[PDB]
RNA sequence: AGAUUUGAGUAUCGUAAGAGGACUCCCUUAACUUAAGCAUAUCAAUAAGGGAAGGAAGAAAAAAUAACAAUGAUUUCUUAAGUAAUGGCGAAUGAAAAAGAAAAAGACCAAGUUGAUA
RNA sequence: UGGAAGUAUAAAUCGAAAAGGUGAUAGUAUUCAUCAAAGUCUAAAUAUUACAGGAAAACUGAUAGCAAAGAAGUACUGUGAA
RNA sequence: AAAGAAUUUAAAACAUAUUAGAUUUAUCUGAUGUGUGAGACCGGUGAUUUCUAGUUAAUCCUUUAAUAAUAAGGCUU
């Protein structure tokens, strides 16, 4: 909305809101990220202190598909099936049917351990597990499978 | 139940199904190789290889072969054909 | 087959027998017009492989080209350029001499179509090629299903656009894969497509 | 924030506007519509296999490929020369990947073949195939009778045992363990006897006269994968004691120990 | 330039549901400039049998 | 005298040229500008100069990806992505496999075989 | 060239094969995986601000909109390009 | 020393053997057995992972199919 800008409220003012001593000239210190170490150094020092230099080894053709490992914590495991299913099997133990929360179907590969789990047995089928994730699943009375 | 994702034995359990075809020559290419060889002979650099091999300098032949062929593996394959020709006279 | 011993023979160019023959041929071509017609190919195995067929409408032309590198065409070697572009020597043409020679035969013979060309010989100054040309208006070429594709109008001056094998290797169409990312379907067309700024009708 | 804008080159000649997008939809649609009018299965989008995706990121998802391998056509008893003429894609470039992939795409072709109805190459009723089909009706009935007869005896135990286990799960959801153990024993015995039998090389093309029920494609009729519901398992004591972390770290450490083994044996 | 604009679908349906519901209020319908004094019911629904003969 | 090889003149039947180049395929080592100077770099397959075609042109059927529960000619769109990488590692430049779609189609030469050979 | 001990082209020299190429950190070796170069054609999906014929418009309304709403690339200038 | 069924029917490479047709050469080309490479165990066997004590080998990370010794790149000063 051009009618809502400051140009329409600065009609009549000579400098159009830019000052009389310091005019609105073409450049205010260069074109782009100029002077990264000379006159805009204090800007880069203040707001991007690690902009200049090198760090870490070069990976000539990085395979970002090999680093794709979505993770879900234990506290969010039962939300994969539902709250009604959770209450349906809330009184199961060893010997009877226990629902299997396979996480690869939901797009989660590694299961992490954070938060708390409901006091029910469960079978967690996932590609990778954490050391503290397996403890919480087994301490509640469940099992940790593996896939692929 | 459903393998494992790490190690040498990694992946979903499945029966993988690939022929390793060998691209090679027939038994008549042996004759064609000889017939052309008599009609042509050896290259200028091939002949200098024969002189080096005669005097028992096998390492200096490979270095000379590498210089004119640009491959260590292709240098051996020439140092064998040349040394085979010496035993054929 | 006869043409399997010839192919094996022709790979031994350094042999004395073949070096003598190329010595004689390069002498004759030095005292002949630069582009002229020969009765039959002097390398009938290579000509047949590239497409030559002993039928009406198939002709063979020999072109002699001065190999080596030339200077940048600037008067007195004076270029008003930055030091990054001030070199006059050591600059090599992108188009191979085979493609360059193929065009000279094409311009000279404007009523025919260039099919392919093969190397013949060279000396300290010249390099000699042999160009296979086809007459598109011959009734034999037109009525043959396997070769009347050359009668298409888009094949006019085939080597000038860069459709012959000699001229298509300079374009970069020698292989496939990640080595030829910039030469997918054409270097300039690929570059334009990558540089397109797609402004969708509904955008944020 | 440090800005990174590649507008220093001439972008104004690099701008592509999509004003033809609304008219592209009408143009493409009027080509699909006018393609079926020529011959309706022209736009049938010839059948394609059910192939897995690549990489571990997508390896569990099935998707359509192009063309069945020559081993898949032979497993389903389909001529590879006739496959392209009945709306089947063929890919001789595809080398077979697994036994499980060969079985799934052999069932895909088998299911498609039963649905497929091939009209005669000549509309007139005096075509050879229609005439020949009437010339083997008595032989077909005799051939059909023995096929049903000798298939009715070999399955006299698996069918009844499968019936028994079906009701056992019902009474267990309205004992069960016996039927599953009993069924598995029968299945092993049947497969054992099969190994301890030359078949037809090619099946018959289903050729018949019928009303023209015109369908726009065949890959939507045969779904890629069956729907997935909630799965449940019996929590035994063996699964309770499986150490997934130890099994993963053992597999990781074993693969990282190949260096020391080769280093030790080389000294 | 940017001729056409983008709007979330759920916000588009929120407005339509708030615009159908606004047509059942005779005060707002009349204020918009509509002569609805003589209509029997403000959510005027006609028989589907009568429409089919038009 | 005869059998061939090569090269010419003439006659007959045709073929090329020139216009246009918005889109298509290419040859060429511009500079202003940016880097707050400037010399590599950027501008930039950009301008100008030159060649060739069509209603579209180019590409097209793996000496290709990938390391997987694997794919599968070419072309175009979405995403990967301003990412990996390149750079007085400064200014700046900058892809591709995977994954989702539009459309789908594969055929031949040479080499080899058959020679009362055509 | 994004291709970094060389991604592609070309020139000088050199130059293979009882095959071989690639797996982008150079080198050798042993395995593994995947293809089989150096000849040709190939529709469909895609581009278009030449030009011609049409339809539309939150576009301009004779100092605006094409330079040109009339015999407009016209009158007029230059040796000429213009 | 202690916990441990492990998932379920359409198969191609050929390490080898025996034959069939040929070649003399760095010699090949076909066809049939076999195992490989196989996986459906019957409270107990058990493939498989822990803990303890020695021995042996490797031990800062990377060169993205796996290793090795050179080389190169990482991290701190």
PDB file of C-alpha atoms in Angstrom, chain D residues 82-190:
ATOM      1  CA  UNK D  82       3.789 -59.104 -26.607  1.00  0.00           C
ATOM      2  CA  UNK D  83       4.155 -57.182 -23.330  1.00  0.00           C
ATOM      3  CA  UNK D  84       4.641 -53.794 -25.006  1.00  0.00           C
ATOM      4  CA  UNK D  85       1.496 -54.250 -27.132  1.00  0.00           C
ATOM      5  CA  UNK D  86      -0.873 -54.831 -24.182  1.00  0.00           C
ATOM      6  CA  UNK D  87       0.075 -51.773 -22.141  1.00  0.00           C
ATOM      7  CA  UNK D  88       3.009 -53.193 -20.162  1.00  0.00           C
ATOM      8  CA  UNK D  89       6.254 -51.278 -19.786  1.00  0.00           C
ATOM      9  CA  UNK D  90       9.420 -53.333 -20.318  1.00  0.00           C
ATOM     10  CA  UNK D  91      12.897 -52.376 -19.059  1.00  0.00           C
ATOM     11  CA  UNK D  92      15.655 -54.731 -20.249  1.00  0.00           C
ATOM     12  CA  UNK D  93      18.165 -52.311 -18.693  1.00  0.00           C
ATOM     13  CA  UNK D  94      16.972 -53.154 -15.163  1.00  0.00           C
ATOM     14  CA  UNK D  95      18.935 -55.991 -13.589  1.00  0.00           C
ATOM     15  CA  UNK D  96      16.990 -57.834 -10.906  1.00  0.00           C
ATOM     16  CA  UNK D  97      17.650 -56.628  -7.363  1.00  0.00           C
ATOM     17  CA  UNK D  98      16.285 -59.300  -5.013  1.00  0.00           C
ATOM     18  CA  UNK D  99      14.123 -62.393  -4.771  1.00  0.00           C
ATOM     19  CA  UNK D 100      11.552 -60.381  -2.810  1.00  0.00           C
ATOM     20  CA  UNK D 101      11.452 -57.851  -5.654  1.00  0.00           C
ATOM     21  CA  UNK D 102      11.049 -60.619  -8.245  1.00  0.00           C
ATOM     22  CA  UNK D 103       8.078 -62.123  -6.393  1.00  0.00           C
ATOM     23  CA  UNK D 104       6.245 -58.829  -5.827  1.00  0.00           C
ATOM     24  CA  UNK D 105       6.452 -57.768  -9.475  1.00  0.00           C
ATOM     25  CA  UNK D 106       5.552 -61.280 -10.624  1.00  0.00           C
ATOM     26  CA  UNK D 107       2.308 -60.947  -8.662  1.00  0.00           C
ATOM     27  CA  UNK D 108       1.785 -57.447 -10.077  1.00  0.00           C
ATOM     28  CA  UNK D 109       1.878 -58.845 -13.615  1.00  0.00           C
ATOM     29  CA  UNK D 110      -0.254 -61.856 -12.656  1.00  0.00           C
ATOM     30  CA  UNK D 111      -2.966 -59.669 -11.113  1.00  0.00           C
ATOM     31  CA  UNK D 112      -2.870 -57.306 -14.102  1.00  0.00           C
ATOM     32  CA  UNK D 113      -3.186 -60.166 -16.598  1.00  0.00           C
ATOM     33  CA  UNK D 114      -6.444 -61.427 -15.078  1.00  0.00           C
ATOM     34  CA  UNK D 115      -7.995 -57.951 -15.249  1.00  0.00           C
ATOM     35  CA  UNK D 116      -6.720 -57.422 -18.797  1.00  0.00           C
ATOM     36  CA  UNK D 117      -9.184 -58.115 -21.616  1.00  0.00           C
ATOM     37  CA  UNK D 118      -7.749 -58.119 -25.147  1.00  0.00           C
ATOM     38  CA  UNK D 119     -10.117 -57.434 -28.018  1.00  0.00           C
ATOM     39  CA  UNK D 120      -9.438 -59.423 -31.208  1.00  0.00           C
ATOM     40  CA  UNK D 121      -7.108 -57.961 -33.817  1.00  0.00           C
ATOM     41  CA  UNK D 122     -10.061 -58.253 -36.235  1.00  0.00           C
ATOM     42  CA  UNK D 123     -13.533 -57.162 -35.141  1.00  0.00           C
ATOM     43  CA  UNK D 124     -15.343 -59.665 -37.370  1.00  0.00           C
ATOM     44  CA  UNK D 125     -16.433 -62.858 -35.618  1.00  0.00           C
ATOM     45  CA  UNK D 126     -14.634 -64.961 -38.261  1.00  0.00           C
ATOM     46  CA  UNK D 127     -11.223 -64.142 -36.771  1.00  0.00           C
ATOM     47  CA  UNK D 128      -8.902 -67.090 -36.194  1.00  0.00           C
ATOM     48  CA  UNK D 129      -8.599 -66.598 -32.432  1.00  0.00           C
ATOM     49  CA  UNK D 130     -12.374 -66.604 -31.977  1.00  0.00           C
ATOM     50  CA  UNK D 131     -12.596 -69.559 -34.374  1.00  0.00           C
ATOM     51  CA  UNK D 132      -9.723 -71.391 -32.663  1.00  0.00           C
ATOM     52  CA  UNK D 133     -11.242 -70.736 -29.230  1.00  0.00           C
ATOM     53  CA  UNK D 134     -14.340 -72.597 -30.434  1.00  0.00           C
ATOM     54  CA  UNK D 135     -12.051 -75.333 -31.818  1.00  0.00           C
ATOM     55  CA  UNK D 136     -10.633 -76.197 -28.368  1.00  0.00           C
ATOM     56  CA  UNK D 137     -13.680 -75.795 -26.108  1.00  0.00           C
ATOM     57  CA  UNK D 138     -13.969 -79.540 -25.482  1.00  0.00           C
ATOM     58  CA  UNK D 139     -10.216 -79.787 -24.857  1.00  0.00           C
ATOM     59  CA  UNK D 140     -10.326 -76.780 -22.520  1.00  0.00           C
ATOM     60  CA  UNK D 141     -13.141 -78.335 -20.477  1.00  0.00           C
ATOM     61  CA  UNK D 142     -11.141 -81.550 -20.093  1.00  0.00           C
ATOM     62  CA  UNK D 143      -8.014 -79.522 -19.305  1.00  0.00           C
ATOM     63  CA  UNK D 144      -9.930 -77.368 -16.816  1.00  0.00           C
ATOM     64  CA  UNK D 145     -11.490 -80.382 -15.084  1.00  0.00           C
ATOM     65  CA  UNK D 146      -8.199 -82.072 -14.185  1.00  0.00           C
ATOM     66  CA  UNK D 147      -6.650 -78.779 -13.038  1.00  0.00           C
ATOM     67  CA  UNK D 148      -9.476 -78.340 -10.531  1.00  0.00           C
ATOM     68  CA  UNK D 149      -9.419 -82.048  -9.646  1.00  0.00           C
ATOM     69  CA  UNK D 150      -5.706 -82.235  -8.831  1.00  0.00           C
ATOM     70  CA  UNK D 151      -5.774 -78.837  -7.108  1.00  0.00           C
ATOM     71  CA  UNK D 152      -8.709 -79.980  -4.943  1.00  0.00           C
ATOM     72  CA  UNK D 153      -6.648 -82.749  -3.295  1.00  0.00           C
ATOM     73  CA  UNK D 154      -3.257 -81.116  -2.695  1.00  0.00           C
ATOM     74  CA  UNK D 155      -4.869 -78.330  -0.635  1.00  0.00           C
ATOM     75  CA  UNK D 156      -7.162 -80.634   1.376  1.00  0.00           C
ATOM     76  CA  UNK D 157      -4.974 -80.093   4.473  1.00  0.00           C
ATOM     77  CA  UNK D 158      -3.695 -76.507   4.227  1.00  0.00           C
ATOM     78  CA  UNK D 159      -7.186 -75.160   3.492  1.00  0.00           C
ATOM     79  CA  UNK D 160      -8.728 -76.986   6.458  1.00  0.00           C
ATOM     80  CA  UNK D 161      -5.879 -76.031   8.798  1.00  0.00           C
ATOM     81  CA  UNK D 162      -6.116 -72.415   7.627  1.00  0.00           C
ATOM     82  CA  UNK D 163      -9.853 -72.596   8.339  1.00  0.00           C
ATOM     83  CA  UNK D 164      -9.095 -73.869  11.848  1.00  0.00           C
ATOM     84  CA  UNK D 165      -6.635 -71.075  12.657  1.00  0.00           C
ATOM     85  CA  UNK D 166      -9.056 -68.463  11.292  1.00  0.00           C
ATOM     86  CA  UNK D 167     -11.715 -69.424  13.843  1.00  0.00           C
ATOM     87  CA  UNK D 168      -9.121 -69.802  16.613  1.00  0.00           C
ATOM     88  CA  UNK D 169      -8.214 -66.118  16.336  1.00  0.00           C
ATOM     89  CA  UNK D 170     -11.937 -65.302  16.351  1.00  0.00           C
ATOM     90  CA  UNK D 171     -12.574 -67.064  19.668  1.00  0.00           C
ATOM     91  CA  UNK D 172      -9.377 -65.394  20.917  1.00  0.00           C
ATOM     92  CA  UNK D 173     -10.862 -62.002  19.961  1.00  0.00           C
ATOM     93  CA  UNK D 174     -14.647 -62.362  20.418  1.00  0.00           C
ATOM     94  CA  UNK D 175      -6.087 -72.577  21.951  1.00  0.00           C
ATOM     95  CA  UNK D 176      -4.753 -70.116  19.386  1.00  0.00           C
ATOM     96  CA  UNK D 177      -1.147 -71.288  19.771  1.00  0.00           C
ATOM     97  CA  UNK D 178      -1.919 -74.868  18.706  1.00  0.00           C
ATOM     98  CA  UNK D 179      -3.349 -73.843  15.326  1.00  0.00           C
ATOM     99  CA  UNK D 180      -0.370 -71.639  14.439  1.00  0.00           C
ATOM    100  CA  UNK D 181       2.069 -74.410  15.371  1.00  0.00           C
ATOM    101  CA  UNK D 182      -0.063 -76.929  13.490  1.00  0.00           C
ATOM    102  CA  UNK D 183      -0.386 -74.691  10.434  1.00  0.00           C
ATOM    103  CA  UNK D 184       3.357 -73.999  10.278  1.00  0.00           C
ATOM    104  CA  UNK D 185       4.151 -77.726  10.328  1.00  0.00           C
ATOM    105  CA  UNK D 186       1.862 -78.296   7.337  1.00  0.00           C
ATOM    106  CA  UNK D 187       3.393 -75.377   5.421  1.00  0.00           C
ATOM    107  CA  UNK D 188       6.921 -76.770   5.805  1.00  0.00           C
ATOM    108  CA  UNK D 189       5.799 -80.223   4.655  1.00  0.00           C
ATOM    109  CA  UNK D 190       4.074 -78.825   1.561  1.00  0.00           C
TER     110      UNK D 190
END
